Design a protein around this ligand. Structure first.
Ligand SMILES: [Cu+2]
Ligand SMILES: [Cu+2]
Lengths: 620, 620
């Protein structure tokens, strides 16, 4: 009965039927995006209205449409024709990926480029990537994909080891014709192979690892009801899934005594951009908006037990729509389980003679996606003490290029002649706050050093200060690790027993933000990535930091636009957008396949409770 | 036969016998410190010389001595009389702690202070803490301890909940007389109790936690030989133990192919300071050099299986000396085990059809200590990919005070009338580097943003720069999280297959450093804590960032002194000293007992290997 339940295959099929009956889904139509809409603010109206949002692409070249349908009433709420040249192109279709390598295969320019490198076109794989927005007015309003080539010697060969530098093509996946083929010069195609399952490269496999068995004889401590509602050690939440955002957490709340206290209404990774810092024209335009342009959700892997998720795992198999509106299940796409987390609290008191120790635990909810050469793991954690944390794990194969003779200031060498362009992996976590309700505010907290003198004769004192962000125009903040800067989200109308507003403190990792030049194209399309923290007044249509249509969009939309409204955020329904990411200068150790590197953030209770909330945990 | 083996009870007894035979350990003598000396540089001389270093205190008031003995030859290498007024007092003796509360109990000033607060002296506990160095020339050359009072209503009561503010006493533990008793005014003694095992405060214990079983049917994957030599997944090291530094790691090396490659010769936490930022005269002098003044090693807890260390644990029981030279075993003071660490590497390749996933694991070596109200956990981790990491875990009971009426800028309120002074927990990790040998150098690496224009027309490029620290005078560095600053330790004479110097990159958490005023007493005694990274030329007598005798020492000694030598560190035997810590503004959630908070650092291989070093890990 929950309005936050996962989408069923039946709802998808019904959306398909609704669109068909309305004439919005003929033979030439394709579903580029489909997701369930969250319940509007104020459920004072019983009986929810299950609504779905759809982006309908037309393979005939006609204009796409944004449609909202009510599966409950079997109707089309609204349908709007879209002008992609203005608002942006729809997410790339999977079927549009295969066409690039296929079309190029019979293009004389492409063939001439390959022949000049003595490469057999049958062995040339083409990575189809987003074109972005540059000095090609020809692409205005067109769905163009740029292709970079990699040689695959045999069917099981890792093409990434054999990049074909100095070459790039542009293809119109709708009119199905190659628009341009650029050849800046031949580069030696790296010869070493990167086959990590090849005995000649791995050498004898280790036989030194003894098994580690993790089990739960009485089953997990968490309950799952309504298909996706989780109850665990006082925590309460609904696990949602969106094809674009991936796993989304709804109604995060904590049972404090006899009352369920909300903390976060909605938590998701609203965007992920991977900007490359190599000035070569072959890759200077390279920027992946995995969440926005490719929809990381639709590439979620089916996680295997014992391999991807170890221990007593409870799976969720979210359903999504295919290009035609048919439901497609992602079997075991989501893992949920609890794991031990060392010591929670400990104290051996000499005076009382009491020796006390308690173990910690965390509830884990995750999924893993694959985008071409990269593989990203998204993990949400809930701890016994009230801490909420997110962790992104980056692995896969590094995107390669040729390593220029004479070195490079923007590329690393991984193998002889093999380069790995510098780049970043930047995420934006959209946190729709609800600290004890929707009346929230954000304070920036800095440590404050004090001068030795009157009132501080010994010069040992230090303090802290808090600045309330009252309007959106003043809510675009940057990190300051040196002064231990954090941001506290509080409810000015809800106080703890000490008469203090309850709150949660966000602790960032303070990693570098977008490095690109402020006037670059990526700096504008990914403006959110230029700052660590943004706070906006909640709005129904403000979902992504980059807007609804990132694919080939001029820029500025998203956060910079929203903030312009300069709305009141001091004790209002607000949203925190936290930018965090990895700056990657590939090492030899990342080749041929890279070890996991991580980045994230967490929020800890700050005077939210009246005392430690884990005093009732048993001795185990 | 290993020169790095743990000390045996027999060696301690022999040190005792040697000192006795030499007349250095009569009835009035006490061992304030005793540790085994590491083998001198160059073991070209077979047959090691097991030497021990001892600080001998005299309860009669005579001068203490620093003595070096050779247990191998049964001789006194050297014995030097110490002038504590100049070089500093010896570590505080445990027997000197009980005398403070005992002496004060019969002092009229103390009794008058207690009577004014209507407190029964039999219920008043006194926390004996280091006096430091301030405007009390009377203390010059004297072993003085300052005492703060806490009320303990009953034998099992938590005194920390009942601080007695406005009162402090100074005691000479040698002449055994109270030097001073300061009373700045009565403060209400917080009444609420902080008994976390009391059903009225904990409420009904949870019954929702199902067990999590972690086992290893075939035993651990690591081997222990020579009592403390560890071999695990290519890693090789010796686990040492010092009463002052706690767990020390020796000869950290990695088996790369058929050669054992050294990385770190010696890794330890050489110092830990806890500076309080409350300007009240009652606590302004409060600074704990747990490692230096109290010797965290001697307070190591005996870790219980299933409680402190879960899973298949292999224990070490280091032996230390008591005040008389008798060996005392710390049963199960060190836990060692391996634990699963999620995904190591993963990639699902569309083109090759190969789906690859591998699990990660970490070797864990830890111990836990208790210092009055605090409990600190020290954890060293070795990962499959070559990463080395340290993690400090802080818990226990927060040091309390009265919460002033009208608020405070340097104290938090935990309960009605109960305050928790602001403070920091700062550590210094001493890393005696040996990246592929002793010829090392350190480079500071910063990300480098590039301006849009010639050679970067799209403004997407970004780079990095490295600056070699050539002399100690230029090796005192600070963090810069904004430019992703890290430090690379490399061997200029040892290159990887790509002709690049091998190295390891240190990743700091970039937390705030010492906040105290630059001219404060703590800023000088803990000068190391004012900067994130120091690099020194290795020397036999440069062991701690604060010198050998921190207790009541003027300051400046340690790192600031060493650096003054301005020695060559560009391709030499060098030591990295990394300052890192927690800045603590106590929250209500930390009371009555605090949940664990953590801080640390790690070092990752940087072109150390010729490719990923975990390609030989099996599919599990
Ligand atoms: Cu990367
Ligand atoms: Cu603390």
């Amino acid at each position: 009965a929950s309005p936050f339940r996962l989408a069923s295959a039946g709802e998808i099929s019904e959306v398909q039927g609704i669109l068909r009956t309305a004439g919005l889904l003929g033979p030439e139509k394709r579903i580029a995006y489909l997701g369930v809409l969250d319940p509007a603010r104020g459920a004072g109206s019983e009986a929810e209205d299950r609504r779905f949002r759809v982006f309908i692409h037309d393979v005939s070249g006609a204009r796409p449409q944004e449609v909202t349908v009510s599966v409950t009433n079997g109707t089309v709420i609204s349908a709007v024709e879209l002008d992609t040249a203005a608002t942006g192109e729809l997410p790339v279709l999977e079927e549009e990926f295969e066409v690039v390598e296929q079309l190029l295969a019979t293009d004389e320019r492409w063939l001439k480029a390959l022949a000049a490198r003595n490469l057999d076109v049958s062995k040339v794989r083409v990575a189809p990537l987003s074109a972005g927005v540059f000095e090609y007015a020809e692409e205005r309003g067109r769905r163009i994909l740029r292709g970079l080539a990699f040689v695959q010697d045999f069917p099981e060969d890792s093409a990434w080891a054999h990049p074909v530098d100095g070459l790039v093509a542009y293809v119109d996946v709708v009119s199905k014709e190659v628009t341009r083929v650029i050849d800046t010069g031949v580069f030696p195609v790296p010869a070493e192979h990167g086959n990590y399952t090849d005995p000649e490269l791995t050498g004898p496999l280790r036989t030194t690892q003894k098994p580690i068995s993790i089990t739960q004889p009485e089953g997990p401590s968490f309950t799952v009801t309504g298909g996706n509602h989780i109850e665990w050690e006082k925590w309460s939440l609904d696990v949602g899934f969106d094809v674009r955002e991936g796993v989304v957490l709804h109604n995060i709340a904590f049972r404090d005594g006899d009352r369920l206290r909300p903390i976060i209404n909605r938590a998701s990774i609203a965007e992920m951009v991977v900007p490359y810092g190599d000035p070569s024209p072959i890759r200077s335009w390279q920027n992946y908006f995995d969440t926005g342009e490719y929809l990381v959700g639709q590439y979620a892997n089916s996680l295997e037990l014992g391999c991807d998720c170890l221990g007593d795992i409870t799976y969720l198999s979210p359903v999504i729509s295919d290009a035609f509106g048919n439901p497609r299940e992602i079997r075991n796409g989501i893992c949920m389980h609890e794991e031990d987390w060392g010591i929670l609290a400990k104290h051996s008191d000499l005076w009382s003679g009491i020796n006390y120790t308690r173990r910690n635990r965390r509830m884990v909810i995750s999924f893993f996606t694959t985008i071409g050469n990269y593989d990203y793991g998204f993990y949400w954690y809930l701890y016994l003490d009230g801490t909420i944390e997110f962790e992104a794990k980056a692995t896969g194969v590094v995107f390669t290029s040729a390593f220029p003779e004479g070195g490079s200031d923007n590329i690393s060498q991984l193998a002889p002649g093999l380069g790995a362009p510098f780049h970043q992996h930047i995420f934006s976590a959209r946190l729709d706050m609800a600290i004890d309700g929707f009346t929230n505010r954000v304070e920036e907290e800095d440590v404050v050093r004090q001068t030795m003198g009157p009132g501080n004769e010994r010069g040992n004192a230090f303090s802290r200060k808090r600045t309330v962000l009252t309007r959106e125009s003043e809510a675009v903040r940057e990190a300051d690790a040196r002064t231990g800067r954090t941001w506290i989200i509080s409810n000015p109308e809800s106080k703890n027993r000490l008469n203090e507003p309850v709150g949660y403190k966000l602790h960032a990792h303070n990693q570098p933000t977008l490095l690109a030049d402020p006037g670059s194209s990526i700096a504008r399309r990914a403006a959110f990535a230029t700052k660590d923290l943004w706070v906006t007044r909640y709005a129904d249509d403000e979902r992504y930091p980059t807007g609804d249509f990132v694919n080939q969009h001029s820029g500025g939309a998203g956060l910079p636009s929203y903030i312009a409204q300069d709305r009141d955020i001091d004790g209002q329904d607000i949203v925190v957008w936290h930018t965090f990411g990895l700056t990657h200068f590939p090492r030899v150790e990342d080749w041929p396949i890279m070890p996991v590197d991580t980045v994230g953030f967490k929020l800890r209770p700050e005077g939210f409770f009246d005392r430690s909330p884990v005093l009732d945990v048993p001795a185990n």
